[PDB]
Design a protein around this nucleic acid. Structure first.
Ligand SMILES: Nc1ncnc2c1ncn2[C@H]1C[C@H](O)[C@@H](COP(=O)(O)OP(=O)(O)OP(=O)(O)O)O1
Ligand SMILES: [Ca+2]
Ligand SMILES: [Ca+2]
Length: 341
DNA sequence: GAGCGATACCGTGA
DNA sequence: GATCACGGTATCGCTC
């Protein structure tokens, strides 16, 4: 088909800009402060101005305070970013009935029925870029290509504020010339098992025994990467359905004292039942991050919806079950509700 | 041998 | 010093 990918530029930071235009140009850094000491947390994202000296998503707010003592450091209002995403999403529904809202920030259109080629597609790309900018003053990148994977990759080259097609000739080029670490879904641990195998391009994955791939990365990515290289990949745009919802919070001190921890855990459950709104989970899992940073979870499915009072009682039993089965101290604790009715 | 639920793992910031 | 949120998958024991 023809997929159009849209991805909002430096999204949290851009929305901050738009809600107070004085920040434009100045370096802006949206943070997740965790409240264990001064500026304890992580950098959610940062406009490109600030991104120039080292301050990217995921690194600590202290290491970020080093590189730019003088930047503007805002707290993250995810609820705000959501509300304005929702709208941009709604604007994109007037350009195709077939839409995959992939995240708060990304969405794919199956526009094969709305145009006939890549130049007509592309000129849509501008129609849409121009619409979002007029209606909401956000700028976005657009990736156009024959499937969802290569349309994400078109965009991840052209950003920031860009647009790029990948005609079938260019696709042929990249299965050969593109590095496998720049494939959607190939992160660090796997790019390594692939260097450790001589595969450094997609096309390289065809001329190897398939169980050799299967053995290393699993039948899933094996079959994923192969189809991509045989150009036989083709996955349809489909609306996603939230399958889980939860909240993990951080504790001012570590601990394995059940009564010190309970307050944090009941808080994760209120923030969770508010996010749930009208949805009735049948499954609950308690989730401890250890002080080692490994992640542990205990769970229980019921044959019926979970009242909050239930969530409270089961949550505390699932926690005790975690304290017996593991001795480490716990740093962060939260819950996660799934299997909605 | 495979189906199914619990849990851990990886990814991606989809 | 390491947030938070979440989907999709592999692995492990029970089970038929
Ligand atoms: N480690 C992270 N932790 C928390 N939030 C993140 C993280 N990474 C990305 N995000 C959030 C904030 C982003 O504005 C938003 C979109 O992710 P992504 O599109 O890759 O980042 P971005 O919009 O800031 O940069 P880009 O311009 O490359 O798209 O998701
Ligand atoms: Ca993105
Ligand atoms: Ca983005």
């Amino acid at each position: 088909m023809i997929v159009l990918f849209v991805d909002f530029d430096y999204f949290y930071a851009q929305v901050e800009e738009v809600l107070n235009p004085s920040l434009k140009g100045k370096p802006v850094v949206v943070c997740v402060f965790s409240g264990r000491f001064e500026d304890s947390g992580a950098v959610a994202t940062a406009n490109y101005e600030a991104r120039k000296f080292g301050v990217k998503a995921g690194i600590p707010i202290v290491e970020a305070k080093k590189i730019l003592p003088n930047a503007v450091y805002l707290p993250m209002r995810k609820e705000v970013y959501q509300q304005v995403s929702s709208r941009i999403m709604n604007l994109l529904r007037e350009y195709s009935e077939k839409i995959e809202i992939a995240s708060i920030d990304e969405a794919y259109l199956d526009i094969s029925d709305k145009v006939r080629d890549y130049r007509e597609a592309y000129n849509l790309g501008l129609e849409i870029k121009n619409k979002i900018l007029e209606k909401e003053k956000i700028t976005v990148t657009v990736g156009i290509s024959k499937n969802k994977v290569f349309a994400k990759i078109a965009a991840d080259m052209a950003k920031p504020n860009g647009i790029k097609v990948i005609d079938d000739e260019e696709v042929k080029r990249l299965i050969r010339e593109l590095d496998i670490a720049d494939v959607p879904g190939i992160g660090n641990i796997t790019a390594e098992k692939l260097k450790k195998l001589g595969i450094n391009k997609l096309v390289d994955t065809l001329s190897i025994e398939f169980d050799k791939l299967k053995g290393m990365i699993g039948e899933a990515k094996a079959k994923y990467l192969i189809s991509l290289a045989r150009d036989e990949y083709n996955e349809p745009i489909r609306t996603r359905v939230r399958k889980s919802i939860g909240r993990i919070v951080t504790m001012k001190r570590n601990s394995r004292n059940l009564e010190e921890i309970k307050p944090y855990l009941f808080r994760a459950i209120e923030e969770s039942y508010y996010k749930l709104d009208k949805r009735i989970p049948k499954a609950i899992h308690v989730v401890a991050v250890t002080e080692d940073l490994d992640i542990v979870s205990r769970g229980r499915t019921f044959p019926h919806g979970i009242s909050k009072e239930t969530a409270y009682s089961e949550s505390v039993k699932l926690l005790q079950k975690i304290l017996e089965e593991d001795e480490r101290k716990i740093r962060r604790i939260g819950v996660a509700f799934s299997k909605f009715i």
